RNA sequence: GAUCGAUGUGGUGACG
């Protein structure tokens, strides 16, 4: 059959750039658990880090990051970045942990290492994630009206 | 009921978003063809070479449906790199915008997708250009958008342990005072970038990316922006919406002259100093040939077309012509083409088998 | 080439996955028609024009496979044995269906 | 007669589905004509009511 | 032209090659498994030394195919020859013993050492033996002559890990608990090169090409090149206990390290970074790889050890004509080509498809939105049908990749199905679940919004 | 490093008799005067003892 | 409770126009003020 | 509520 149409090859080896990925832009107490977290970071173990991280008490996180060794906070930042994308149930606790980290422990300290590219990726990720706020608000309004109709 | 032959010349489409381009490899006119396709058309003989499919998706002619449009395209270092921009605007609030880079495979003799970028900008892309200098070590692409940012993309090594590959990554992001970016251009050398932010023009150094200079005469927003070539390369020409054509001298950082000429098409000759401007008068389109050094036009022709001229192009003729007079000398280097509103292309002219014997048809 | 001594080879053509059920010359003899077991497409090889045309689609023909066929001596018709006792008549030059004939019971063989 | 008209191999739909084709084309879309299925579930129906009462607290 | 299949949106190795193996099988033994060694011959039996018994096991074969038990106490370091016919061993008595893999008594006994001996190995020529014992000395012996060729004494503590070189005869490397690794070689009576390790050296290995020596001490694994004498190219720590043993894959690129932390790390040599991990029940004393990566054997602190198994043709003179190959469309593509939008939507909501590939369902939802017939497909359904759609929306709306199209779909469903909300309690429950998910996502995004401001402050402070 | 080996009884005391721990269990428990080789085997079969292990393990 | 009634009552929009203007104004500036809230969180925590 | 010129309202091929 005669057709004067030429089709370029589109395969699965092509690089895809979405806004969320880096290339698109640019005294004996149980008050803390530092010694479990440090060797959970030295050896990447899912269960040990899940025991340490999955908490809710704020001052526990405060004292844990205070007593933590100062050359291993960056692995903690990687694990927070990895665990932030997920269902909100696990994500809210991780946001609380991150807020506890940057708010008090390293508000002055993190200015020193000059390692901003490591933090930049998390900035881009949470910049990308919040793009659907107003659509979610519209959906929430309609759902509230529908629920009003339910009762 | 199957197709045996096709008789077609230049494809008629409702709107030609891209300009008239010339593919360096085939010396053929490239523009919008079928919806989602770029037509490659031979200028010498009124025959269509082919259609190249950029978006490979089903098309339905049902009325009142928003369709994806291929808006911008450009050719990079010779014909090696092709950049395509597509968008869909179902509503004003949300836009789908996508950019694709195609590299030419010499062995395959076809294009293959290299890098696909989803949402490169947050608003419509207005300009697209490449660095055709060959003195620059790295190929460079610039995308400007109405969101107020222009982005500089560079080709970087993407090799890893598993496989060896190359890809495009973002290099620089620029803005000025939250103003929309309308036009962008490179100098002949690739050393300077001229980008128009609404009324004003800003000049950046491409090597280190700092804002070197700024020109703002309070006349109007810049419609067309171009650099001079060859012996007038020190000059920069700017046309405004309020019918003003002004020439800037980069060395003096001041404007040499300006005129009231409302131009819709301004194309710089690649192989000559001449600038040809198509001005939309009430009676019809008019043409002016001039050189940026001198504020007087060399040749003036009126009534070239009763209809509006929306695009034009200069094509380097392979064998140069000879015209001694300065009025006709602009015809020597290259041929000029222009496309009217009714999609008519106009230009300027001075003038046996062995089986016959095997099967015994010869008896 | 037909000679009692050697029979030299003129040309041989190999199709990809087309075991030939029946191949015959046309009545005038300029073209060769071939068919396969359990295949819909009928292959026509025009020697004078040097073109090999695969006729995969015949409009108005519901037959799933084309294997058994005959050609008229005068060269104006081509007849295809179908199923459910159906005989289909095709014009030789354009390969387009003219009409259909139905018999009671299966079609075993047919001739012009 | 039953197998010849409503048996396996025939192309039959339900009256609820057949009457719902018009609803998909109306200027204002509606749901199925008979929205409730009586015999889809009975135990599952009760738990939904139990969960609902809990939800208002 | 031709019909074009719908695009499937995508949202952004060693893992596949290192997980092909089947379920582990456990073999019980008595005593700790001090080492496991494979034989190069196509019968890939492995020798497991444990307590006073050296057991030879075949492929599978949970019972030992052979047993050498003539040891009064804790035999050491069974190692195969390149022919897979002889094996060297050690003992706490101090004698080096050659065994035939089909015999019952040692062929040659060497009596030089005074205390327990822990490392033995063959040479490039398959007729000499290198040993090192707990009396701080290493000896080189000849097999046919049955006498000691040479002695070296340059170590201050227990010498308990030795290696030899396949490429160069007389070139061998030994390791001790005195933290040093000394390389005795060539034809001379003194060490040509020495290497310092920070901790007692559990294991040493020689890379075949290029001369890379890998030493394992404590958590550290250090790489030393011989092109520049005593050049520490890289030191790696990825274990949280002592690195017990180190092995090299059949391909040179992969390197394996086992340790007390019950975890085995797989590294690439070109990149010198982790490419895979393995987890086990007990601490790995011994790690062994079969031909290619067919069998992986790990011997534990306890008795058990884990084994991880993985018509007619064209003639030359004929002219070739190529027939097109029939292309198979997916079922949803076939429905779309025939304009069966409702059937396509029903197909993508297959619970198999939703669980395994939600991306496909999202893709056809987006395509139906592009065609402008999403409302037609969504409308006209009963409570049982709409419950499945609402379940999919509940399960997948929170994900950022699917968020806009699913939000639009939820908008359309709400607009269509508002008037019939009172009849079905289950639809009400599904809507309540969706609403609660919506509030939780909004609150999470607000917390993120605060975090963006804090990070902007810290970034600009820099 | 902390690797604790399994304990091995070098001597045993059974029925006022000293049993060597380095013998195989079947031969080891024949040091009792009343017990012979067949009685040892039948007793160990009844008491499901692995016979490939020494008296010490 | 009364939203259904609010649907039946004609000419509802002009009566509640001021409340609509209020909500448009407040909703328009929520995200910037959330960023400022985070910044003030960091400042107040640092000071105290 | 139907109606004595009434016409099913209307979707896209092909090579084991």
* CB within 8 Å: C48 and B359: yes
Length of chain B: 363
Contacts of G42 in chain A (CB under 8 A): 102-103, 107
A135 has a chain B CB within 8 A of its CB: no
Q: With beta carbons less than 8 A apart as the criterion, state whether A36 and A70 touch.
A: no
Q: With beta carbons less than 8 A apart as the criterion, state whether C13 and E317 touch.
A: no
**3-state class (DSSP) for residue B11:** coil
The H or E element that residue E197 is part of is none
Give me F1's structure tokens.
Answer: 């490093």
**3-state class (DSSP) for residue A106:** coil
Q: For residue E292, what are the CA distances in angstroms to E17, E165, E249, E289?
A: 11, 20, 7, 8
Give me B131's structure tokens.
Answer: 């660095």
User: In the Cβ-directed half-sphere of B155, how many Cα atoms lie within 13 Å?
Assistant: 19
Cα separation, B297 vs E45, whole angstroms: 94
Nearest to E371 among B60, B94, B162 (CB): B60
A19 closest CA partner among B128, B98, E9, B57: B98
State how far residue E448 is from chain G, nearest Cα, in angstroms.
Answer: 9
Cα separation, E123 vs E141, whole angstroms: 10
Q: Residue F9 — φ and ψ, nearest 5°?
A: -80, 110
DSSP-derived secondary structure letter, B279 = E
Contacts of E396 in chain A (CB under 8 A): none
Q: With beta carbons less than 8 A apart as the criterion, state whether A41 and A72 touch.
A: yes
Q: Residue F42 — φ and ψ, nearest 5°?
A: -70, -35
Q: Residue B137 — φ and ψ, nearest 5°?
A: -70, -30
Contacts of E6 in chain A (CB under 8 A): none
DSSP-derived secondary structure letter, F54 = B
Question: Touch between chain E and chain F (3+ CB pairs, < 8 Å)?
Answer: yes
Tell how many helices (H) and how many strands (E) occur in chain A: 7, 2
- Residue pairs spanning A and E at CB distance below 8 A: 125
Q: Residue C24 — φ and ψ, nearest 5°?
A: -145, 160
* CB within 8 Å: B355 and C59: no
Question: Touch between chain G and chain F (3+ CB pairs, < 8 Å)?
Answer: no
Contacts of A6 in chain E (CB under 8 A): none
- Of all residues in chain B, the one with the smallest CA distance to C50 is B353
Among F52, F53, F55, F56, most E C-beta atoms within 10 A, so best to mutate, is: F52
Q: For residue E440, what are the CA distances in angstroms to A146, E290, E434, E450?
A: 18, 52, 10, 16
Among G1, G20, G39, G45, most A C-beta atoms within 10 A, so best to mutate, is: G45
* CB within 8 Å: C48 and B353: yes
H-type alpha helices, E216-357: 331-337, 341-348, 351-356
Nearest to E314 among C9, C14, C19 (CB): C14
Cα separation, B352 vs B66, whole angstroms: 55
List the strands of the sheet with E159-164, edge to edge. Answer: E159-164, E172-176, E180-184, E193-196
Nearest to E4 among B58, B65, B162 (CB): B58
Q: Calculate Rg over the CA atoms of chain B.
A: 23
**3-state class (DSSP) for residue D38:** coil
Q: With beta carbons less than 8 A apart as the criterion, state whether A77 and A122 touch.
A: yes
Q: How far is CA F35 from the centre of its chain?
A: 13
Cα separation, B200 vs B202, whole angstroms: 7
- Of all residues in chain E, the one with the smallest CA distance to G45 is E454
E343 strand H contact, CB < 7 Å: no
* CB within 8 Å: E32 and F53: no
How many CB atoms sit inside 10 A of residue A20's CB? 20
Contacts of A104 in chain G (CB under 8 A): 45
State how far residue E177 is from chain B, nearest Cα, in angstroms.
Answer: 37
Q: Calculate Rg over the CA atoms of chain E.
A: 33
Tell how many helices (H) and how many strands (E) occur in chain F: 2, 2
- Helical pair A58-67 and A88-100, crossing angle rounded to 10 deg: 50
How many CB atoms sit inside 10 A of residue B332's CB? 15
- Of all residues in chain C, the one with the smallest CA distance to B353 is C48
Length of chain C: 112
E314 strand H contact, CB < 7 Å: no
Cα separation, E62 vs E299, whole angstroms: 14
E contact residues 354-383, partner B, Cβ 8 Å cutoff: 371-372
Method: cryo-EM
Cα separation, A1 vs C54, whole angstroms: 11
| Residue whose entry in the numeric block shows the structure tokens 């990825």 | E238
- Which residues in G have their CB inside 8 Å of a CB on E? 31, 34-39, 41-42
Q: Say if residue E406 is exposed, middle or buried (CB neighbours under 10 Å; 0-12, 13-18, 19+).
A: buried
* CB within 8 Å: B116 and A13: no
Cα separation, B182 vs B126, whole angstroms: 6
**DSSP output for E264-296:** EEEEETTT-SEEEEEE-SS-EEEEEE-STTSEE
**3-state class (DSSP) for residue E362:** helix
Give the burial string for B149-170 (b: 16+ CB within 10 Å, else e). bbbbbebeebeeeeeeeebbbb
Strands C13-15 and E319-321: what pairing? parallel
Bridge partners of B353?
Answer: none
**3-state class (DSSP) for residue E448:** helix
**DSSP output for B125-183:** EEEEEE---SSSSS-EEEEEETTS-EEEEEEEE---SS---EEEEEEEEE-STT--EEE
**DSSP output for B166-230:** EEEEEEEEE-STT--EEEEEE-SSSSEEEEEETTEEEEEETTT--EEEEE--TT--EEEEEE--G
C50: left (phi over 0), alpha (psi -120 to 50) or beta: left
Q: Say if residue E162 is exposed, middle or buried (CB neighbours under 10 Å; 0-12, 13-18, 19+).
A: buried
E302 has a chain A CB within 8 A of its CB: no
How many CB atoms sit inside 10 A of residue E71's CB? 19
Q: With beta carbons less than 8 A apart as the criterion, state whether B113 and B102 touch.
A: yes
* CB within 8 Å: C12 and E322: no
Cα separation, C30 vs C71, whole angstroms: 14
Chain breaks in chain E (C to N over 2.5 A) after: 12, 310
C54 strand H contact, CB < 7 Å: yes
The whole-number Å distance from E334's CA to H14's C1' is 15
DSSP-derived secondary structure letter, D57 = -
How many CB atoms sit inside 10 A of residue C95's CB? 16
Cα separation, B340 vs B356, whole angstroms: 52
B6: left (phi over 0), alpha (psi -120 to 50) or beta: beta
Q: With beta carbons less than 8 A apart as the criterion, state whether A86 and A129 touch.
A: no
**3-state class (DSSP) for residue E195:** strand
Give me B243's structure tokens.
Answer: 């019918």
Q: With beta carbons less than 8 A apart as the criterion, state whether B49 and B28 touch.
A: yes
E328 strand H contact, CB < 7 Å: no
Cα separation, E348 vs E332, whole angstroms: 7
E strand residue ranges, E295-416: 295-300, 305-309, 319-321
| Residue whose entry in the numeric block shows the structure tokens 């014992």 | E133
| Residue whose entry in the numeric block shows the structure tokens 């977290």 | A37
DSSP-derived secondary structure letter, A15 = E
- Residue pairs spanning B and C at CB distance below 8 A: 17
Task: Flag residues 224-283 of E with CB < 7 Å from strand H.
Answer: none
State how far residue G38 is from chain E, nearest Cα, in angstroms.
Answer: 4
Q: For residue B119, what are the CA distances in angstroms to B51, E325, F12?
A: 26, 37, 81
Cα separation, A47 vs A57, whole angstroms: 19
**3-state class (DSSP) for residue A62:** helix
E323 closest CA partner among C64, C11, C12, C56: C56
The resolution in angstroms reads 2.7
């Amino acid at each position: 059959a005669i057709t004067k149409v030429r089709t370029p090859v589109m395969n699965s080896e092509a690089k895809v750039l979405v806004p969320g990925i880096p290339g698109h832009h640019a005294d004996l107490q149980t008050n803390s658990f530092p010694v479990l977290l440090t060797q959970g970071l030295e050896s990447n173990d899912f269960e040990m880090l899940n025991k340490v991280l999955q908490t809710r008490n704020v001052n526990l996180i405060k004292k844990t990051v205070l007593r933590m060794p100062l050359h291993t906070i960056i692995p903690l930042l990687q694990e927070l970045t990895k665990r932030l994308q997920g269902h909100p149930n696990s994500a809210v606790l991780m946001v609380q942990w991150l807020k506890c980290v940057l708010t008090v422990h390293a508000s002055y300290l993190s200015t020193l290492p000059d390692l901003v590219p490591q933090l930049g990726t998390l900035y881009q990720l949470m910049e990308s994630r919040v793009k659907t706020f107003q659509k979610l608000s519209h959906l929430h309004g309609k759902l509230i009206l529908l629920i009003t109709q339910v009762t | 009921l199957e197709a045996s032959a096709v008789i077609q010349g230049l494809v008629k489409d409702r709107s030609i978003f891209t300009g008239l381009m010339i593919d360096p490899r085939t010396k053929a006119l490239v523009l919008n063809g079928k919806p989602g396709h770029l037509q490659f058309y031979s200028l010498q003989s009124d025959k269509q070479l082919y259609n190249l499919d950029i978006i490979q998706q089903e098309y339905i002619n049902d009325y009142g449906l928003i369709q994806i449009e291929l808006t911008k395209a450009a050719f990079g270092c010779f014909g090696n790199w092709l950049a395509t921009v597509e968008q869909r605007q179902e509503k004003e609030t949300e836009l789908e915008l996508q950019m694709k880079l195609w590299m030419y495979n010499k062995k395959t003799q076809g294009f293959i997708l290299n890098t696909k970028i989803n949402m490169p900008h947050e608003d419509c892309i207005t300009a697209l250009c490449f660095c055709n200098a060959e003195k620059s070590e790295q190929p460079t692409l610039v995308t400007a958008s109405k969101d107020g940012y222009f982005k500089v993309w560079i080709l970087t090594d993407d090799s890893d342990i598993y496989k060896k590959a190359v890809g495009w990554t973002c290099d620089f992001v620029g803005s000025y005072h939250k103003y929309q970016a309308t036009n962008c251009c490179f100098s002949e050398d690739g050393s300077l970038l001229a980008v128009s932010f609404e009324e004003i023009v800003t000049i950046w150094d491409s090597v280190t990316w700092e804002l070197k200079c700024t020109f703002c005469q309070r006349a109007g927003k810049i419609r067309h922006l171009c650099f001079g070539r060859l012996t007038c390369s020190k000059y920069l020409l700017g046309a405004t919406e309020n019918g003003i054509l002004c020439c800037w001298n980069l060395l003096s950082c001041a404007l040499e002259w300006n005129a009231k000429l409302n131009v819709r098409v301004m194309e710089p000759d690649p192989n000559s100093e001449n600038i040809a401007a198509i001005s939309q008068s009430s009676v019809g389109s008019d043409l002016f040939v001039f050189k940026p050094s001198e504020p007087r036009p060399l040749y003036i022709q009126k009534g070239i077309s009763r209809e509006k001229v929306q695009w034009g192009v200069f094509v380097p003729r392979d064998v140069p012509e000879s015209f001694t007079s300065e009025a006709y000398q602009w015809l020597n280097r290259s041929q000029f083409y222009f496309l009217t509103k009714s999609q008519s292309l106009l230009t300027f002219s001075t003038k046996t088998t062995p089986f016959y014997f095997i099967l015994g048809k010869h008896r | 080439q037909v000679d009692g001594k050697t029979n030299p080879k003129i040309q041989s053509i190999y199709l990809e996955r087309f075991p030939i059920f029946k191949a015959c010359f046309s009545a005038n003899g300029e073209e060769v028609l071939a068919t396969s077991t359990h295949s819909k497409v009928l292959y026509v090889y025009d020697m004078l024009a040097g073109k090999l045309i695969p006729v995969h689609q015949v409009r108005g023909l519901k037959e799933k496979i084309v294997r058994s066929f005959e050609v008229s001596p005068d060269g104006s018709f081509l007849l295809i044995n179908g199923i459910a006792g159906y005989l289909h008549l095709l014009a030789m030059k354009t390969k387009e269906l003219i009409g259909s004939m139905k018999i009671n019971g299966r079609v075993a063989a047919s001739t012009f | 007669i039953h197998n010849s008209l409503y048996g396996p191999g025939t192309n039959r739909t339900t009256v609820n589905k057949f009457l719902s084709l018009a609803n998909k084309r109306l200027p204002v879309k509606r749901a199925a004509v008979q929205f409730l299925n009586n015999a889809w579930g009975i135990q599952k129906k009760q738990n939904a009511k139990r969960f609902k009462r809990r939800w208002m607290v | 032209a031709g019909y074009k299949p719908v695009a499937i949106q995508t949202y952004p190795q060693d893992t596949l090659y290192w997980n092909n193996y089947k379920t582990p099988v456990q073999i019980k033994e008595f005593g700790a498994v001090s080492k496991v060694d494979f034989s190069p011959q196509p019968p890939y039996n492995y020798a497991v030394t444990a307590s006073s018994r050296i057991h030879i096991y075949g492929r599978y074969s949970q019972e030992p195919i052979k047993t050498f038990s003539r040891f009064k106490d804790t035999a050491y370091c069974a190692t195969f020859r390149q022919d897979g016919r002889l094996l060297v061993a050690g003992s706490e008595d101090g004698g080096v013993q050659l065994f035939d893999i089909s015999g019952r008594a040692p062929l040659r006994q060497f009596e030089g050492h005074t205390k327990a001996v822990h490392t033995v190995d063959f040479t490039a020529d398959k007729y000499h033996v290198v040993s090192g014992a707990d009396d701080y000395t290493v000896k080189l012996w000849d097999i046919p002559n049955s006498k000691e060729i040479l002695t070296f004494k340059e170590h201050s503590d227990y010498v308990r890990c030795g290696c030899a070189s396949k490429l160069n005869p007389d070139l061998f490397i030994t390791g001790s608990y005195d933290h040093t690794v000394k390389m005795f070689d060539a034809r001379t009576s003194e060490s040509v090169l020495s290497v310092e390790h920070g901790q007692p050296v559990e294991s040493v290995l020689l890379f075949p090409s290029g001369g890379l020596l890998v030493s394992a001490g404590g958590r550290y694994v250090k790489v030393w090149d011989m092109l520049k004498g005593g050049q520490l190219l890289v030191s790696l720590k990825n274990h949280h206990k002592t690195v017990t043993c180190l092995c090299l894959s059949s391909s040179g690129q992969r390197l394996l390290s086992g340790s007390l932390d019950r975890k085995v790390k797989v590294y690439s040599t070109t990149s010198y970074k982790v490419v895979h991990s393995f987890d086990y029940a007990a601490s790995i004393l011994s790690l062994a790889l079969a031909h290619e990566d067919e069998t992986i054997v790990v011997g534990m602190t306890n008795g058990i050890l884990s084994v991880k198994h993985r018509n007619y043709m064209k003639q030359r003179d004929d002219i070739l004509i190529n027939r097109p190959a029939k292309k198979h469309l997916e079922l949803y593509d076939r429905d779309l080509k025939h304009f069966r939008i409702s059937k396509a939507l029903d197909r993508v909501l297959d619970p198999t498809c939703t669980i395994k590939t939600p991306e496909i369902t999202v893709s056809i939802i987006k395509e139906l939105n592009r065609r402008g017939v999403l409302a037609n497909a969504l409308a006209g359904r009963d409570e049982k049908e709409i419950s499945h759609v609402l379940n999919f929306l509940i399960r997948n709306l929170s994900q950022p990749r699917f968020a806009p199209v699913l939000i639009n779909a939820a908008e359309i469903i709400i607009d269509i199905y508002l008037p019939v909300i009172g009849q079905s309690p289950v639809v009400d429950k599904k809507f309540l679940l969706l609403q609660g998910l919506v509030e939780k996502e909004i609150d999470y995004q607000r917390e993120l919004l605060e975090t963006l401001g804090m990070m902007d402050m810290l970034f600009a402070t820099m | 490093s902390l690797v604790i080996p399994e304990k091995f009884q070098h001597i045993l005391r059974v029925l006022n008799t000293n049993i060597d721990g380095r013998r195989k269990i079947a031969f080891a428990i024949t040091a009792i005067k009343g017990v012979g080789r067949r009685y040892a085997h039948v007793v160990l079969r009844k008491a499901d003892i692995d016979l490939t292990k020494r008296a010490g393990e």
